[PDB]
Enzyme design. Sequence first.
Site, mmCIF file in Angstrom:
data_model
loop_
_atom_site.group_PDB
_atom_site.id
_atom_site.type_symbol
_atom_site.label_atom_id
_atom_site.label_comp_id
_atom_site.label_asym_id
_atom_site.label_seq_id
_atom_site.Cartn_x
_atom_site.Cartn_y
_atom_site.Cartn_z
ATOM 1 N N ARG A 1 -9.452 5.797 -5.166
ATOM 2 C CA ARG A 1 -10.510 4.949 -4.603
ATOM 3 C C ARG A 1 -11.130 5.703 -3.395
ATOM 4 N NH1 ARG A 1 -7.128 -0.802 -3.644
ATOM 5 N NH2 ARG A 1 -5.622 0.816 -2.797
ATOM 6 N N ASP B 1 -7.056 -4.499 6.628
ATOM 7 C CA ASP B 1 -6.313 -5.172 5.644
ATOM 8 C C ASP B 1 -6.754 -6.592 5.506
ATOM 9 O OD1 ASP B 1 -4.427 -5.705 3.781
ATOM 10 O OD2 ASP B 1 -2.757 -5.834 5.205
ATOM 11 N N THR B 2 -7.297 -7.029 4.339
ATOM 12 C CA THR B 2 -7.649 -8.442 4.084
ATOM 13 C C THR B 2 -6.580 -9.141 3.236
ATOM 14 O OG1 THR B 2 -8.876 -8.292 1.951
ATOM 15 C CG2 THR B 2 -10.064 -7.867 4.051
ATOM 16 N N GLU C 1 -5.096 -11.632 0.225
ATOM 17 C CA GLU C 1 -5.295 -11.427 -1.203
ATOM 18 C C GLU C 1 -5.702 -12.683 -1.937
ATOM 19 O OE1 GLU C 1 -4.689 -7.815 -2.080
ATOM 20 O OE2 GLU C 1 -4.857 -8.435 -0.022
ATOM 21 N N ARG D 1 -12.398 1.629 -1.094
ATOM 22 C CA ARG D 1 -11.456 0.875 -0.287
ATOM 23 C C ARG D 1 -12.040 0.806 1.158
ATOM 24 N NH1 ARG D 1 -5.868 0.026 1.445
ATOM 25 N NH2 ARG D 1 -6.385 -2.183 2.369
HETATM 26 CA CA LIG Z 1 -4.863 -6.436 1.563
#
Ligand SMILES: [Ca+2]
Length: 135
Positions: free
Chosen positions: A81, A34-35, A37, A29
Amino acid sequence: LHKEPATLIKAIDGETVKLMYKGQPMTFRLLLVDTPETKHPKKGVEKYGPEASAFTKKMVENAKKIEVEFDKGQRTDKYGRGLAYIYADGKMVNEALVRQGLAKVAYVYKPNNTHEQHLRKSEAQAKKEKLNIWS
Ligand SMILES: [Ca+2]
């Protein structure tokens, strides 16, 4: 911290990449980012998620050296992860995604937050640049 060799197996998306580390395939991870989706069952695809995964793909795939770096706190999350900063030829992907307006800093949890102000410095630059999620 300590940087370590790891070998690319598979870039799943923006924030998730599978890597052989210590001779074991592992899901990693990208820590602190934060990307958007590509697949969320209650959603479809989110705006810039396609090009956030594209970006990371290109980045881990054309690299001659991939290196992961763990932070000073727990190294595995709940879904098992690896928790890390990924360097493709020594450049931090986790940073690259935020500099390019394709990632916001997020879920920043003490003590896994060593590089929180570097990335929080980069999001600021991309916002000031009208780039991509900040457009
Ligand atoms: Ca995300």
